Design a protein around this motif. Structure first.
Motif, PDB file in Angstrom:
ATOM      1  N   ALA A 154      23.442  48.258  34.353  1.00 55.01           N
ATOM      2  CA  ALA A 154      24.350  47.164  34.616  1.00 55.01           C
ATOM      3  C   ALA A 154      24.875  47.168  36.045  1.00 55.01           C
ATOM      4  CB  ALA A 154      25.491  47.163  33.587  1.00 55.01           C
ATOM      5  N   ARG A 155      25.140  48.356  36.625  1.00 53.52           N
ATOM      6  CA  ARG A 155      25.469  48.481  38.031  1.00 53.52           C
ATOM      7  C   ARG A 155      24.341  48.070  38.978  1.00 53.52           C
ATOM      8  N   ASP A 156      23.086  48.459  38.726  1.00 49.06           N
ATOM      9  CA  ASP A 156      21.938  48.050  39.512  1.00 49.06           C
ATOM     10  C   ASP A 156      21.691  46.535  39.492  1.00 49.06           C
ATOM     11  N   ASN A 157      21.767  45.893  38.302  1.00 44.41           N
ATOM     12  CA  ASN A 157      21.757  44.442  38.173  1.00 44.41           C
ATOM     13  C   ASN A 157      22.946  43.772  38.844  1.00 44.41           C
ATOM     14  N   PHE A 158      24.156  44.341  38.751  1.00 44.55           N
ATOM     15  CA  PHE A 158      25.316  43.782  39.411  1.00 44.55           C
ATOM     16  C   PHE A 158      25.274  43.933  40.942  1.00 44.55           C
ATOM     17  N   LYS A 159      24.862  45.107  41.459  1.00 39.59           N
ATOM     18  CA  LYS A 159      24.659  45.329  42.884  1.00 39.59           C
ATOM     19  C   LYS A 159      23.596  44.398  43.438  1.00 39.59           C
ATOM     20  N   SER A 160      22.502  44.163  42.691  1.00 34.45           N
ATOM     21  CA  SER A 160      21.535  43.143  43.048  1.00 34.45           C
ATOM     22  C   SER A 160      22.099  41.736  43.003  1.00 34.45           C
ATOM     23  CB  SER A 160      20.199  43.250  42.263  1.00 34.45           C
ATOM     24  N   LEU A 161      22.823  41.350  41.941  1.00 41.91           N
ATOM     25  CA  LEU A 161      23.463  40.053  41.746  1.00 41.91           C
ATOM     26  C   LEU A 161      24.386  39.655  42.878  1.00 41.91           C
ATOM     27  N   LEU A 162      25.086  40.591  43.520  1.00 48.94           N
ATOM     28  CA  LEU A 162      25.917  40.353  44.670  1.00 48.94           C
ATOM     29  C   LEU A 162      25.173  40.094  45.961  1.00 48.94           C
ATOM     30  N   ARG A 163      23.903  40.531  46.005  1.00 51.22           N
ATOM     31  CA  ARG A 163      23.030  40.170  47.098  1.00 51.22           C
ATOM     32  C   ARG A 163      22.411  38.818  46.796  1.00 51.22           C
ATOM     33  N   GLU A 164      22.157  38.527  45.510  1.00 48.86           N
ATOM     34  CA  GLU A 164      21.661  37.243  45.054  1.00 48.86           C
ATOM     35  C   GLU A 164      22.667  36.086  45.214  1.00 48.86           C
ATOM     36  N   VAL A 165      23.953  36.254  44.807  1.00 47.16           N
ATOM     37  CA  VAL A 165      24.995  35.230  44.961  1.00 47.16           C
ATOM     38  C   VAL A 165      25.390  35.003  46.425  1.00 47.16           C
ATOM     39  N   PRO A 166      25.722  36.013  47.229  1.00 40.98           N
ATOM     40  CA  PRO A 166      25.713  35.807  48.677  1.00 40.98           C
ATOM     41  C   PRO A 166      24.773  36.773  49.393  1.00 40.98           C
ATOM     42  CG  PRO A 166      27.579  37.195  48.147  1.00 40.98           C
ATOM     43  CD  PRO A 166      26.900  36.800  46.843  1.00 40.98           C
ATOM     44  N   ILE A 167      23.781  36.236  50.131  1.00 42.06           N
ATOM     45  CA  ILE A 167      23.013  37.034  51.078  1.00 42.06           C
ATOM     46  C   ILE A 167      23.896  37.621  52.183  1.00 42.06           C
ATOM     47  N   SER A 185      38.164  39.522  44.793  1.00 41.74           N
ATOM     48  CA  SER A 185      38.716  38.405  44.056  1.00 41.74           C
ATOM     49  C   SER A 185      38.228  37.058  44.528  1.00 41.74           C
ATOM     50  CB  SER A 185      40.254  38.380  44.174  1.00 41.74           C
ATOM     51  N   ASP A 186      37.481  36.988  45.642  1.00 45.56           N
ATOM     52  CA  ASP A 186      36.919  35.741  46.125  1.00 45.56           C
ATOM     53  C   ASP A 186      35.416  35.695  45.799  1.00 45.56           C
ATOM     54  N   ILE A 187      34.734  36.866  45.785  1.00 45.16           N
ATOM     55  CA  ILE A 187      33.377  37.043  45.262  1.00 45.16           C
ATOM     56  C   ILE A 187      33.298  36.819  43.749  1.00 45.16           C
ATOM     57  N   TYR A 188      34.340  37.211  42.977  1.00 40.58           N
ATOM     58  CA  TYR A 188      34.408  36.974  41.543  1.00 40.58           C
ATOM     59  C   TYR A 188      34.321  35.480  41.138  1.00 40.58           C
ATOM     60  N   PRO A 189      34.994  34.494  41.690  1.00 42.65           N
ATOM     61  CA  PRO A 189      34.761  33.114  41.280  1.00 42.65           C
ATOM     62  C   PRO A 189      33.379  32.586  41.611  1.00 42.65           C
ATOM     63  CG  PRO A 189      37.017  33.342  42.057  1.00 42.65           C
ATOM     64  CD  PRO A 189      36.297  34.658  42.320  1.00 42.65           C
ATOM     65  N   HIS A 190      32.739  33.056  42.696  1.00 40.70           N
ATOM     66  CA  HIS A 190      31.359  32.711  43.011  1.00 40.70           C
ATOM     67  C   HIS A 190      30.349  33.196  41.990  1.00 40.70           C
ATOM     68  N   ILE A 191      30.558  34.391  41.420  1.00 43.75           N
ATOM     69  CA  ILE A 191      29.633  35.038  40.501  1.00 43.75           C
ATOM     70  C   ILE A 191      29.991  34.796  39.042  1.00 43.75           C
ATOM     71  N   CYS A 233      33.740  46.552  37.758  1.00 46.06           N
ATOM     72  CA  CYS A 233      33.369  45.467  38.624  1.00 46.06           C
ATOM     73  C   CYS A 233      33.986  45.527  40.003  1.00 46.06           C
ATOM     74  CB  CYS A 233      33.704  44.095  38.005  1.00 46.06           C
ATOM     75  N   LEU A 234      35.284  45.840  40.102  1.00 49.79           N
ATOM     76  CA  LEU A 234      35.960  46.054  41.362  1.00 49.79           C
ATOM     77  C   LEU A 234      35.439  47.273  42.103  1.00 49.79           C
ATOM     78  N   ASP A 235      35.198  48.399  41.410  1.00 49.75           N
ATOM     79  CA  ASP A 235      34.580  49.584  41.981  1.00 49.75           C
ATOM     80  C   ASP A 235      33.169  49.328  42.517  1.00 49.75           C
ATOM     81  N   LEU A 236      32.310  48.598  41.776  1.00 48.06           N
ATOM     82  CA  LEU A 236      31.024  48.161  42.297  1.00 48.06           C
ATOM     83  C   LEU A 236      31.097  47.146  43.430  1.00 48.06           C
ATOM     84  N   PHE A 237      32.091  46.245  43.439  1.00 48.75           N
ATOM     85  CA  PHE A 237      32.370  45.434  44.611  1.00 48.75           C
ATOM     86  C   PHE A 237      32.762  46.230  45.844  1.00 48.75           C
ATOM     87  N   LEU A 238      33.612  47.258  45.717  1.00 47.73           N
ATOM     88  CA  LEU A 238      33.942  48.156  46.806  1.00 47.73           C
ATOM     89  C   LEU A 238      32.756  48.993  47.296  1.00 47.73           C
TER      90      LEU A 238
END
Lengths: 146, 71
Positions: free
Chosen positions: A66-79, A88-94, A111-116
């Motif tokens: 789930a972390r690997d998919n989420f870390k990928s998803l954050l590259r997918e939602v914003p390059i 908290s601003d990346i969260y409404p986008h995703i 989710c916050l720890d993986l965002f950091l």
């Protein structure tokens, strides 16, 4: 949902020889039926708790991924996710991304720890490109004289 | 674009690979791409308009696509 009399009624009705065997074998007690039933429910419950949260086997479906998919998803939602973009601003986008719903719905903190962690890895790479660029600039042999 | 002796170049989606594309019924097209779909219809001559767009489950990578004439 299972009392001993209900568990007995299921097996009393069918007249089940494996249940009856506890009354028929001299090394077992007829009240040992309840002891076995309590112990088997307790081992099954303990193993369901361990299995649904922490698997002790191999090749299943735990956390981690789930972390690997989420870390990928954050590259997918914003390059190239900006090092000044906040959690908290990346969260409404995703929040459109279902992949995130899988991670957030297990733990809001993770989710916050993986965002950091993801943003911090990008910030380190941004420093390395800048420091290499500063080193290439100073290495230029403009040995001024006179 | 194809015409007799006239082969020319031209919306739609140019930023993603196209898994599938096909014509539907009369005067309609659908373009299935990895991330999202496109429902395209002809408008005028060189113009086209997407009447609807799809996600996959809710935001995945589509594995494959096939189609019939109306299906």
């Amino acid at each position: 949902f299972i009392t001993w009399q209900q568990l007995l009624n299921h097996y009393v009705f069918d007249k089940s020889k494996r249940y009856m065997a506890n009354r028929h074998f001299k090394v077992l007690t007829h009240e040992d039926v309840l002891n076995e039933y309590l112990k088997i429910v307790n081992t099954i419950e303990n193993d369901l708790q361990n299995k649904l949260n922490e698997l002790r086997l191999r090749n299943y479906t735990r956390d981690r991924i789930a972390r690997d998919n989420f870390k990928s998803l954050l590259r997918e939602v914003p390059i190239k996710i900006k090092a000044n973009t906040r959690w908290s601003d990346i969260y409404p986008h995703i929040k459109s991304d279902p992949r995130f719903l899988h991670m957030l719905g297990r733990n809001g903190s993770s989710c916050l720890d993986l965002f950091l962690d993801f943003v911090d890895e990008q910030r380190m790479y941004i420093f390395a490109q800048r420091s290499i660029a500063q080193q290439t600039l100073i290495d230029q042999n403009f040995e001024w004289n006179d | 674009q194809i015409d007799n002796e006239s082969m020319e170049e031209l919306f739609k989606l140019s930023q993603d690979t196209t898994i599938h594309t096909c014509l539907m019924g009369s005067h309609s097209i659908i373009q299935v791409c990895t991330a999202e779909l496109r429902h395209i219809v002809p408008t005028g001559k060189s113009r086209y308009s997407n009447k609807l767009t799809w996600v996959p489950p809710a935001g995945i990578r589509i594995v494959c696509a096939t189609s019939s004439k109306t299906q």
